[PDB]
Every structure is written in structure tokens, then in C-alpha cells.
């Protein structure tokens, strides 16, 4: 019983975190086999190809705890620097670089000066920002999922935007969203609520005995989607209805009956009631998150 | 910027988690130096001294990943079993066994069959329960804080109570609260809201630019405490006012001015507004948690 924002155990990622310094700029890197990955900003209008051609291997200080790693090669891939080192990280887990979709969740290991500070779950918002928790020095901190023994790295932290939300890249240095790794007027676009996640979370609440918000009513996909649009919820698709199948089955509540409940919650609010300890409709749990945690 | 329920990085604890089996009962243990700690329930009205005297070392299967640990001694300390093993855990961190107070937070590493599944933050409620997330098999999962390099273990998971909340022990096997490790009519007592934490979190919101709920008003400790009692909030003490000092100073808001804001929030509710992404007054962040995460 119970329902928490649960992160993956961070051990496998902690053994990969290093400190990278160039000049008087320090930030975090990720040490997998004999490569260290970090934000190319570590070498800072800028023209990064110009800035990098002016560097040598000896201009990069990499520290894994105490041990200094010798840099023997450097190259840029999009917004990430790859520092080749003379030692394979003996703690390298099985890993993959995957890009996630808006609406998907991942764990963030927040790190300062190469030292892990804390782990929390995040969703990629529809507007390709994340509502993270990051202070000066967290640049290079990574986001990940773990399946069996395999770490799927999906995010590397770069920027804080003016609304206090966060912007970064996948591990091949491609930004999520229309953001750049320099100072501009850039701002988060308008965001939406992740409908499939809100329905997943209502399923979690049912599995955990919160049933107050249910009703005998139903609706069609199309009449649901007309109320969705009105309250800045993204459209529900048949794929979404299909991925909610296993939760529908476990609870005996049709997806379109759960939609009728959500329409009533959006039209009436909660009348001072809570669901799974929240007074608002939570949208940062995926169907997979609910199945992973509930039973 | 941002404010998340952040857990400690779990690596140091993951390297200590083992599986313990006795008969057909399996649960989790904690392997520190040459001792394994687990819930004595693993040997299950029961009379545990009777049950334990009937066991031998060979009746305990301890598995650290694949490696079977040889049990060379067994003893009971309150509700915890101590299995002496022939090998010191080479991954033992610096550690302490500390008992926490109601209102204090800790990280939970939820584990199944000796394998870590997920990490989340919990508070010890005033009624000495925790609102955890635990499924069958999580028995033995531990709660902890980390200071520098030192793991302070504070909780070992035992029971789910009929409201779906959780009960366990400190690492010397002394229960938090008036609970026993057997089936009875036992239930959580009435709970209260942790006032000092709610004020800490309002400070976090200010540090992060949520200031809508502030007012020009003040109150005394005693007039605050009269509204506290009415809404099932615990009393605020001068110690509490003292521990809020550093957050008061950083924000320039007197503790008793923040109390006046809280009284208004309790009397009026939020009028459909949010604070740090919540529509209700959050009480599971300590003053230390806010200082740790904010700046
Ligand atoms: C990390 O701190 C980081 C990464 C990319 C761009 C920037 C900027 I402008 N300031 N810090 C950055
Ligand atoms: C762990 O599962 C555990 C610990 C203590 C007591 C009990 C009981 I009764 N069922 N499971 C227990
Ligand atoms: Cl790999
Ligand atoms: Cl120690």
C-alpha cells in the first residue's frame, strides 16, 4: 500500500559521477568505460568549435573522488564534450543512451563538484522543460531509468530558464526543446497537463482504495477530448487507452469511465477532498510508474 | 531553483542489502561488517525466544547477490535478528544507528528479495507511523540519512497497519510507536500536522519566489497555538522558532509573521492557488531539508 514519487536506486549512477574543470569552471561529468561526458559549456555569443580548437588534453582536469584521470582525447558531440581518459571506469554499469518523450518520467541524481547530493523523480513536460531542483554547480547532473541491471541515461542538465524550470540535453548533446546552451531571451513555452498520466494516477488511487471520485457515468474519447482542450489537458489517444488496459483490467474500471470521473473532477474541483494525499490532479506518474509501484 | 521531495543517494545502502531466508520465509537484511540485521519475523501468538532456541545457524540462508554467506552465530535484539557471518561486507560504509523523532525525515530504500527497487523520502508522523510505499516482500527495507560519508540508519520496515500506513523499528529492534511484530487489532492513533515543517516549507516557497500568501500582519506564539489546536496542528515552541531562525534571516520574514500567514491559510484555504506546486500545506520537509535544498 501507499503511493510515493519513487526514484530508481542511484548506486549505479553514483559510481560514474566525476568532476571536470577547465580554467576556473567546474561541473559534473559522467564516466562510462574510458569516456567522460559533460556539458560543453565547461570550456566557456560563444562559438564552441573555435573555443574547443584552442584547448589541449592538459587543459581538462577530471577528478574521480581523489584520483585524477589523465585526458588523452577530446571531441564535441552537439552540446556535450567527450573527454577520452586512459582508464576505463571499473564501476561502469550496463548502460544505453535513450531519448525520452514528453510525459515520460526519469530519476535525477543532483550532483555538485562531482559529488552526488540527492535523487528525485521528474517528468519531461510537454513543453520539453523539467521542474527540477538544481542549484549553481549542478550542471552535468544526469537523469536515468533502470531496467533490470541496465541504466538508460536520458538527460544531462544544462540551464535554468527564467520561470525556474530546467532545460537540458540527451547524452548525445541534443537539447530537449527549442533551447540553446548560451544566454538568450529563451523562455519555456506554454505547457499542458499530461492526461494519460492523470488517468494512470486515478487508477493508482483506486488500487489503493481512494474511490470517492468515481461515478456510474461514461463518455466517448471525443466528448472527453472536448473537455480536455478546455482545461489545457492534452488529447487522449487510442494508444493511451490501450496502454491504460492493464490498469483498467486490474481495477475493473473502463478507461472511458475513468475519463468521465476526470471530466467531473475538472468541472467541480475536489470540494476540499484529496486523492493519494494530493489536493490537485497529479500528472508526473506514467502508467508504467503505477504498475511498478502498485499491486 | 525548484523544490522536490529529494532522497539521499542510495548507493552506500544498496551495497549492504542482502536476502535472508528461514524455512519458506524470505525478506531483506542489512549486512554491515560481519553482521546481518533483519526482522526477527523471518523465523515465523508467537513466543520468539522459544522459536529462536529451536533454530541453528544452518537454518539461515543469507544471499548477497549470488554469494551465499555462511552464518556462524545468531542472536535476537528486541524485534531484530543479528546473524553473524564469516565475511565482513567490504562495501560497509561509515555508519551509525540513530533513532529519529516524530517530524524528522529519512530516505527509504524499498527492497524485494534483497534487491533494491526504489528510493523515496518519508517523515516519521507524530503518531509514529510512516506513509510509505511498500508491497509484500519489503520487510527489512531500511530508512536512513547521510551526513558527509556517514549513513545514519533510523528505520527497519516491519508492518502495514489497516489504514495502509507503515510501522517499524529502529536498528536495535525497538518499535516506533505502540506497535508489535505480530497480528493484533493494533491501529494507528490520531495524527497531527507537523507545524514547524509547514512553516519551513512556506520559507522554501518564499526563497523560490511564491509570496502570494504573505501578509503585513503578525501574531504571538500563544494566539498562533490557539488556531493550531483548532486545525489539528501540533504546538509551536521557542526551540522551533529558534530552529526557523536561519530561514527567517535568509528571507527577512519574522517567524511570527510567517505564523500569521499560516493562520490566514488555515482560516481561508488557498482559493484554488498553489504553493511549490501543492494545493495543500505540506508538512514532510524539515527546516534542515529546506536549507539543504534551497539557496
Ligand atoms: C551549466 O552550468 C551550463 C550549461 C550550459 C550553459 C550554461 C550557462 I549560459 N550557464 N551555465 C551553463
Ligand atoms: C515482515 O513482513 C514482517 C515483519 C514483522 C511482522 C510481520 C508480519 I504479522 N507479517 N509480515 C511481517
Ligand atoms: Cl553497456
Ligand atoms: Cl562505522
Swiss-Prot record, chains A, B:
Organism of derivation: Severe acute respiratory syndrome coronavirus 2 (2019-nCoV)
Enzymatic reactions: TSAVLQ-|-SGFRK-NH2 and SGVTFQ-|-GKFKK the two peptides corresponding to the two self-cleavage sites of the SARS 3C-like proteinase are the two most reactive peptide substrates. The enzyme exhibits a strong preference for substrates containing Gln at P1 position and Leu at P2 position
Effect of residue 199 to V: In strain: Zeta/P.2
Active-site residues from the entry: 41, 139
Stretches of the chain found on the membrane's Cytoplasmic side: 1-295
All residue ranges annotated as the Peptidase C30 domain in the record: 1-295
Highest taxon listed in the record's lineage: Viruses
Subunit field text: 3CL-PRO exists as monomer and homodimer. Only the homodimer shows catalytic activity. Interacts with host FBXO22; this interaction promotes the proteasomal degradation of nsp5.
Protein name (Swiss-Prot/TrEMBL): 3C-like proteinase nsp5
Activation and inhibition: Inhibited by pyridone-containing alpha-ketoamides compounds 13a and 13b. In turn, alpha-ketoamide 13b (tert-butyl (1-((S)-1-(((S)-4-(benzylamino)-3,4-dioxo-1-((S)-2-oxopyrrolidin-3-yl)butan-2-yl)amino)-3-cyclopropyl-1-oxopropan-2-yl)-2-oxo-1,2-dihydropyridin-3-yl)carbamate) inhibits SARS-CoV-2 replication in human lung cells. Inhibited ex vivo by michael acceptor inhibitor N3. Inhibited ex vivo by compound 11a and 11b.
Amino acid at each position: 500500500s501507499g503511493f510515493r514519487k519513487m526514484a530508481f536506486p542511484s548506486g549505479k549512477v553514483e559510481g560514474c559521477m566525476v568532476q571536470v574543470t577547465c580554467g576556473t569552471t567546474t561541473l559534473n561529468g559522467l564516466w562510462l568505460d574510458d569516456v567522460v561526458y559533460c556539458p560543453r559549456h565547461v570550456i566557456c555569443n560563444p562559438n564552441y568549435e573555435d573555443l574547443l580548437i584552442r584547448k589541449s588534453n592538459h587543459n581538462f582536469l577530471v577528478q574521480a573522488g581523489n584520483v585524477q584521470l589523465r585526458v588523452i582525447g577530446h571531441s564535441m558531440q552537439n552540446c556535450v564534450l567527450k573527454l577520452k581518459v586512459d582508464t576505463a571506469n571499473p564501476k561502469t554499469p550496463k548502460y544505453k543512451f535513450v531519448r525520452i518523450q514528453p510525459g515520460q518520467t526519469f530519476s535525477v541524481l543532483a550532483c555538485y563538484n562531482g559529488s552526488p547530493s540527492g535523487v528525485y523523480q521528474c517528468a519531461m513536460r510537454p513543453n520539453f522543460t523539467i521542474k527540477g531542483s538544481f542549484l549553481n554547480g549542478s550542471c552535468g547532473s544526469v537523469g536515468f531509468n533502470i531496467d533490470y541491471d541496465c541504466v538508460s541515461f536520458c538527460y544531462m542538465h544544462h540551464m535554468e530558464l527564467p520561470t525556474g524550470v530546467h532545460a537540458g540535453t540527451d547524452l548525445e548533446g541534443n537539447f530537449y526543446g527549442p533551447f540553446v546552451d548560451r544566454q538568450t531571451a529563451q523562455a519555456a513555452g506554454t505547457d499542458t497537463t499530461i492526461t494519460v498520466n492523470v488517468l494512470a494516477w486515478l487508477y493508482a488511487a483506486v488500487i489503493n482504495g481512494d474511490r470517492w471520485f468515481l461515478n456510474r457515468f461514461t463518455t466517448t474519447l471525443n466528448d472527453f477530448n472536448l473537455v480536455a482542450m478546455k482545461y489545457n489537458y492534452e488529447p487522449l489517444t487510442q494508444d493511451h487507452v490501450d496502454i491504460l488496459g492493464p490498469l483498467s483490467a486490474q481495477t475493473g474500471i473502463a478507461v472511458l469511465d475513468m475519463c468521465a470521473s476526470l471530466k467531473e473532477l475538472l468541472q467541480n474541483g475536489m470540494n476540499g477532498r484529496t486523492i493519494l494525499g494530493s489536493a490537485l490532479l497529479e500528472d508526473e506518474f506514467t502508467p508504467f510508474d503505477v504498475v511498478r509501484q502498485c499491486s
